[PDB]
Short mmCIF file of C-alpha atoms in Angstrom, two decimals:
data_model
loop_
_atom_site.label_atom_id
_atom_site.label_comp_id
_atom_site.label_asym_id
_atom_site.label_seq_id
_atom_site.Cartn_x
_atom_site.Cartn_y
_atom_site.Cartn_z
CA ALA A 1 145.98 26.91 -61.24
CA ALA A 2 145.02 27.43 -65.32
CA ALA A 3 142.45 30.00 -65.66
CA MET A 4 140.75 30.26 -68.37
CA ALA A 5 137.57 33.06 -68.96
CA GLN A 6 138.06 34.55 -64.99
CA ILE A 7 136.06 37.34 -63.08
CA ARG A 8 136.11 39.96 -61.16
CA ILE A 9 133.22 40.76 -59.11
CA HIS A 10 133.42 44.63 -59.16
CA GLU A 11 132.52 46.69 -55.70
CA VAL A 12 134.59 44.27 -53.15
CA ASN A 13 137.22 43.77 -55.90
CA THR A 14 137.13 39.87 -56.23
CA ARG A 15 138.25 37.32 -59.01
CA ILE A 16 136.97 34.08 -58.77
CA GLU A 17 139.93 32.23 -61.24
CA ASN A 18 139.50 28.31 -61.07
CA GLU A 19 137.70 27.28 -63.37
CA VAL A 20 134.53 25.36 -61.77
CA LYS A 21 134.12 28.50 -59.04
CA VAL A 22 133.23 30.20 -62.18
CA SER A 23 131.33 28.06 -64.21
CA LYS A 24 129.35 27.17 -61.46
CA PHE A 25 129.33 31.72 -61.33
CA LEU A 26 127.27 32.45 -63.35
CA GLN A 27 125.58 29.41 -63.74
CA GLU A 28 123.72 31.38 -60.48
CA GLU A 29 123.82 34.23 -63.01
CA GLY A 30 122.03 33.14 -65.60
CA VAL A 31 125.00 32.89 -67.72
CA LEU A 32 126.26 30.66 -70.25
CA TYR A 33 129.87 29.56 -70.47
CA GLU A 34 131.11 27.07 -72.76
CA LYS A 35 134.88 26.46 -73.42
CA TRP A 36 135.45 25.02 -77.11
CA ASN A 37 138.00 23.09 -79.36
CA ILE A 38 140.06 26.63 -79.64
CA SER A 39 142.93 23.82 -81.00
CA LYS A 40 140.38 23.52 -84.41
CA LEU A 41 140.85 26.23 -85.65
CA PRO A 42 144.21 26.65 -88.56
CA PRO A 43 147.14 28.48 -87.60
CA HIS A 44 145.63 30.93 -90.69
CA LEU A 45 143.29 32.07 -89.07
CA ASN A 46 144.92 31.50 -85.76
CA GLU A 47 145.06 35.85 -84.42
CA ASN A 48 143.62 37.25 -87.69
CA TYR A 49 142.28 40.44 -88.15
CA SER A 50 142.16 41.19 -91.33
CA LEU A 51 139.66 37.95 -92.18
CA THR A 52 138.28 37.89 -96.01
CA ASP A 53 134.91 36.68 -96.30
CA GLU A 54 136.28 32.91 -96.80
CA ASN A 55 137.40 33.57 -93.80
CA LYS A 56 134.37 34.47 -91.68
CA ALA A 57 132.89 31.49 -93.72
CA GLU A 58 136.15 28.59 -92.81
CA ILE A 59 136.14 29.68 -88.64
CA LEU A 60 132.31 29.47 -89.02
CA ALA A 61 132.86 26.27 -91.08
CA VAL A 62 135.25 24.66 -88.41
CA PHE A 63 132.58 25.64 -85.60
CA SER A 64 129.40 24.67 -87.66
CA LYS A 65 128.12 21.31 -84.35
CA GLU A 66 128.96 24.10 -81.64
CA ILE A 67 127.05 26.61 -83.57
CA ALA A 68 124.42 24.41 -83.95
CA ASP A 69 123.50 23.02 -80.89
CA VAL A 70 124.16 26.20 -78.75
CA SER A 71 121.55 27.51 -81.63
CA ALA A 72 118.91 24.36 -81.08
CA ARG A 73 119.71 25.21 -77.49
CA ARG A 74 118.38 28.83 -77.52
CA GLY A 75 116.38 28.13 -80.77
CA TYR A 76 118.33 30.82 -82.14
CA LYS A 77 118.63 31.59 -86.55
CA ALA A 78 121.72 33.56 -87.58
CA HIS A 79 125.30 33.95 -87.11
CA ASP A 80 128.48 36.24 -88.16
CA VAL A 81 131.88 37.47 -88.03
CA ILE A 82 133.58 40.48 -86.74
CA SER A 83 137.07 41.74 -85.94
CA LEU A 84 137.43 43.93 -84.07
CA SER A 85 141.07 45.97 -83.79
CA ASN A 86 143.40 48.79 -84.24
CA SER A 87 143.06 48.83 -88.19
CA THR A 88 139.23 49.39 -88.27
CA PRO A 89 139.19 52.74 -89.05
CA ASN A 90 135.89 52.58 -86.50
CA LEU A 91 137.00 51.33 -83.88
CA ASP A 92 136.53 53.78 -80.63
CA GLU A 93 132.89 54.62 -82.72
CA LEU A 94 131.81 51.21 -82.37
CA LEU A 95 132.38 50.62 -78.61
CA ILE A 96 131.31 53.25 -77.42
CA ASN A 97 127.37 52.46 -77.72
CA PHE A 98 128.36 48.89 -76.20
CA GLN A 99 130.72 50.21 -73.09
CA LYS A 100 126.80 52.72 -72.11
CA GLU A 101 125.40 49.25 -70.30
CA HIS A 102 122.97 48.18 -71.58
CA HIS A 103 120.28 45.29 -72.16
CA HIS A 104 118.63 43.12 -75.20
CA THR A 105 115.11 41.46 -75.19
CA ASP A 106 117.13 38.63 -76.04
CA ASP A 107 120.48 36.74 -75.24
CA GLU A 108 123.97 38.10 -76.63
CA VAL A 109 125.94 35.26 -76.85
CA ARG A 110 129.25 35.46 -78.62
CA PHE A 111 132.75 32.92 -78.78
CA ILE A 112 135.81 34.50 -78.30
CA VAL A 113 137.73 33.17 -81.64
CA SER A 114 140.66 35.31 -81.01
CA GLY A 115 141.67 38.36 -78.31
CA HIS A 116 139.81 38.79 -75.38
CA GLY A 117 137.17 40.91 -74.57
CA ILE A 118 135.06 42.12 -71.00
CA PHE A 119 132.11 41.89 -70.24
CA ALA A 120 130.95 43.88 -66.95
CA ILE A 121 127.48 42.36 -66.48
CA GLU A 122 124.70 42.99 -63.77
CA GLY A 123 124.10 40.19 -60.90
CA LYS A 124 121.33 38.44 -59.69
CA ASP A 125 122.06 39.81 -55.76
CA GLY A 126 122.47 43.82 -57.64
CA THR A 127 126.42 44.26 -58.43
CA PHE A 128 128.37 43.86 -61.47
CA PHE A 129 130.80 41.54 -62.16
CA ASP A 130 133.50 41.39 -65.00
CA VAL A 131 133.61 38.34 -67.18
CA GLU A 132 137.00 38.24 -68.67
CA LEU A 133 136.74 36.00 -72.14
CA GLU A 134 139.94 34.70 -74.27
CA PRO A 135 139.84 32.77 -77.87
CA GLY A 136 137.68 29.19 -77.38
CA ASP A 137 134.96 31.11 -74.45
CA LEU A 138 131.47 31.46 -75.61
CA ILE A 139 129.06 33.01 -73.81
CA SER A 140 125.24 34.04 -74.15
CA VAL A 141 123.87 37.03 -71.68
CA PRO A 142 120.45 36.90 -70.90
CA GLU A 143 118.05 38.40 -72.19
CA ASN A 144 117.19 41.82 -69.78
CA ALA A 145 120.65 41.14 -67.94
CA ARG A 146 122.48 44.88 -67.99
CA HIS A 147 125.99 44.82 -69.07
CA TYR A 148 128.31 46.96 -70.85
CA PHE A 149 131.34 45.05 -73.26
CA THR A 150 134.48 46.74 -73.65
CA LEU A 151 138.00 45.28 -75.18
CA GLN A 152 141.38 44.22 -73.24
CA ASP A 153 144.27 45.93 -72.48
CA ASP A 154 145.55 43.64 -75.48
CA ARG A 155 142.63 46.38 -77.71
CA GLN A 156 141.69 43.78 -80.08
CA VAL A 157 139.06 40.77 -80.84
CA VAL A 158 137.22 38.51 -83.11
CA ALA A 159 133.67 37.24 -82.85
CA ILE A 160 131.38 35.24 -83.58
CA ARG A 161 127.99 36.86 -83.10
CA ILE A 162 125.24 34.41 -83.20
CA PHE A 163 121.90 35.25 -83.20
CA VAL A 164 118.19 34.85 -82.03
CA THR A 165 116.60 37.12 -83.87
CA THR A 166 117.94 40.14 -85.67
CA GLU A 167 116.11 42.83 -83.93
CA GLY A 168 117.80 41.73 -80.72
CA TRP A 169 122.18 42.76 -80.89
CA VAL A 170 120.41 46.48 -79.97
CA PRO A 171 120.94 47.78 -77.09
CA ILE A 172 118.02 48.92 -74.96
CA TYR A 173 119.47 51.63 -72.62
#
């Protein structure tokens, strides 16, 4: 009963928390889930949303190999880092775009560096489920999966946006 990356299935309000049951579940639905060594992260970068460019390029350096592997697996090109939190003067106005149910023509892959997030993703059967993400969680939302995204009750995330193509973060509503 230690939980990482829990699922809340929507219409039947059910939670899968045991971590083998979750990774298997996400496997059935076409979604990659990996856990990386978030403990390979320095303390200064632990929960730092006032991120500078020397910071972002180090977060990237720490996880270069994991990125490499995931980029190789899905044949992706680039990566960056974004921090969302109160004290982003435009949080609401950004988030609103991706809370609207959408899909992309590429996988959307994200690794949670600090804070939390939730991807609500349309299952194969037809039912949505929430994928509640903590620091250390890597997630790929497959191309054409219908989803939306949301911050948790903490209202702050820092993620590594990894990219198949430039044109694939674009929401198709």
